Symmetry: C2
Subunit: 105 residues, 2 copies
Amino acid sequence: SQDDSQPWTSDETVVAGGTVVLKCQVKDHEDSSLQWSNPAQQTLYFGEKRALRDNRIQLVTSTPHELSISISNVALADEGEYTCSIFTMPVRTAKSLVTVLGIPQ
Amino acid sequence: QDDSQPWTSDETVVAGGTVVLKCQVKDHEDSSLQWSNPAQQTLYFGEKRALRDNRIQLVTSTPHELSISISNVALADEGEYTCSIFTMPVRTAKSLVTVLGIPQ
């Protein structure tokens, strides 16, 4: 079902130690801010404003249509569903499943 | 015991009434305070509003205090609201909001 106030993001699969990029986009922001929260649902970025304090996480892009952040040196603990929320009326959310894999053989 | 550890108290209200959520911190380390609901949805990040709910107003937002109110309270409002201070590491304080029914 199409909805312009519904942002979209994408799953990401990375090897432990790698870098992940969580990208969220929205076509009609209704003058509401984008937010990225982690698997424990802790706020990572509210707009361009950093929240949870973690040196590996950095703001890549923040426009009213896009909120994108990166996580360098990815760890098993980073695994899970990250939610991108747009606080329009009513709220819409999009999830990005981050999967962390170890090294084989 | 920590200066940067926020605190708030529980609020018991009668359905239809108003509940005020008040959180404070002694030393904010220049870190934002944020209220989230029982579903963990951001309600207010600093003075910036998040979830859209006509009933929720900002009572006051300073670097040591963040208070919001929820008018015309309902059962769907019951739960643990969390007040977070995004210092390093993060600190939280749960506020259990209990909504009471009316006898008879």
